[PDB]
């Protein structure tokens, strides 16, 4: 089951939080103004810790590592020269990161470092503007808690919207209509984007609120308890925007939940915009709009990669040891070739690795070769590395 022991008790850590983004001068995480919560961890590791031992960071009830982009992940942790001290892995089910020590701890004593993570609240729990949340985490078995105020800037206005989250393939975009509950007729909403497109009305769901309690400040409403419109009038426009015709809504409030597609080979800054045109409570045409922007951080949207290959005598070479190394030569994983001569490593974060084939005594490869180790460079980007063996 485990590569080593839980060594929480042998990792001595100090933790602090730092608010980033537009709310920092107001002591708040401004969730729609680049706000996030940075977690900073300084640690030392006992000399008795070995390769495969691990410590954990439990992110508690209220926050997760990462911000707006799914799936959430943690990073490996390195020393001052980029050598990997521990491999980071995150389990969404338990909201816990595991940091598994490499052979760094067997090479060096007085192992110490620091790392940081960006984090965001679960929008279904941190629901309300100005909510002061006791953000309690556990770092190497020791609790750390600080109250943190979150604010999404929901305003009681004709139209406001926010990006709930983003994945490689789509964003969930939330638009609130007529929170001010004014009498409105001829109501229409255009959803448009830079970096996004609609292809089907199936991408858009419309809900009528029973009362203002359903307009959750976090823009991640409880859809299970909202009244969903069966026959919503939705057109996908030739430019890839969509128009939702709500009609003569009177004083009713509406929520539109949309899932615009990301565009392949777009980067920089995505934008999703809600444009609300209507006739107002005085029979005058009006127009209101709101826009949200989001960075396509490819590294945070990418899936995990892997590679593999065959080893043979130049007949399959079964049970050959193959190590996965970081570019600095630290071992990240080990495996052996199976009965068909095949090995693999998967769930690898994009980047550069070395693959080390351990030579049986008396054999050399058919890249560099030293002290009976054949080492090949590999680049992972969400391929095949083979080795033929010949007598010396």
Curated annotation (Swiss-Prot):
Query: Under which name does UniProt file this protein?
Result: Uro-adherence factor A
Source organism per UniProt:
Staphylococcus saprophyticus subsp. saprophyticus (strain ATCC 15305 / DSM 20229 / NCIMB 8711 / NCTC 7292 / S-41)
Functionally, this protein is described as follows: Involved in adherence to the cells of the urinary tract. Shows hemagglutination with sheep erythrocytes as well as good adherence to human T24 bladder carcinoma cells when overexpressed in a strain with non-hemagglutination.
Q: Which gene encodes it?
A: uafA
Shown portion of the complete protein runs from 393 to 809 of 2316
The protein's location, in the record's own words, is:
Secreted, Cell wall
Determine the domain of life of the protein's source: Bacteria
């Amino acid at each position: 089951a485990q590569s080593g022991r839980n060594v929480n008790h042998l990792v001595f850590a100090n933790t602090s939080y730092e608010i980033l983004g537009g709310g920092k001068k107001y002591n708040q995480v401004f969730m729609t103004m680049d706000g996030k919560l940075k977690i900073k961890i300084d640690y030392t590791v006992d000399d008795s810790v070995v390769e495969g031992d691990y410590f954990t960071v439990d992110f508690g009830k209220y926050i997760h590592p990462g911000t707006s982009r799914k799936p959430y992940r943690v990073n490996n942790i390195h020393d001052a020269n980029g050598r990997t001290i521990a491999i980071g892995s995150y389990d969404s089910a338990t909201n816990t990161a595991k940091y598994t020590f490499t052979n760094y701890v067997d090479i060096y004593n007085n192992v110490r470092g620091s790392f940081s993570l960006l984090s965001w609240p679960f929008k279904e729990l941190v629901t309300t503007d100005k909510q002061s949340v006791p953000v309690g985490i556990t770092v190497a078995g020791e609790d750390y808690t600080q109250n943190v105020i979150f604010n999404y800037g929901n305003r009681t206005v004709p139209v406001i919207s926010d990006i709930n989250y983003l994945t490689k393939d789509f964003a969930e975009f939330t638009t609130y209509i007529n929170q001010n509950r004014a009498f409105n007729t001829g109501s229409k909403v255009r959803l448009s984007g830079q970096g996004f497109k609609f292809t089907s009305p199936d991408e858009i769901e419309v809900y009528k609120v029973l009362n203002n309690s359903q307009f959750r400040d976090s823009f991640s409403p409880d859809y299970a308890n909202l009244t969903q419109v069966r026959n919503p009038k939705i057109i996908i426009n030739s430019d890839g925007s969509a128009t939702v015709d709500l009609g003569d809504i009177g004083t009713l409030g509406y929520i539109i939940r949309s899932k615009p597609n990301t565009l392949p080979d777009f980067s920089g800054i995505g934008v999703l915009k809600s444009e609300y045109t209507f006739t107002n409570n005085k029979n005058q045409r009006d127009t209101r709009a709101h826009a949200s922007s989001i960075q396509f951080v490819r590294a945070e949207l990418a899936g995990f990669g892997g590679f593999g290959g065959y080893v043979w005598f130049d007949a399959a070479a079964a049970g050959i040891t193959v190590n996965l190394l970081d570019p600095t030569g630290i071992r990240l994983a080990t495996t052996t070739t199976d009965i068909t001569g095949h090995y693999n490593f998967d769930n690898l974060t994009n980047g550069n690795y070395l693959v080390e084939f351990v030579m049986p005594e008396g054999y050399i490869p058919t890249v560099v070769f030293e002290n009976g180790r054949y080492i090949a460079h590999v680049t992972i980007k969400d391929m095949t590395i083979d080795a033929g063996l010949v007598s010396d």
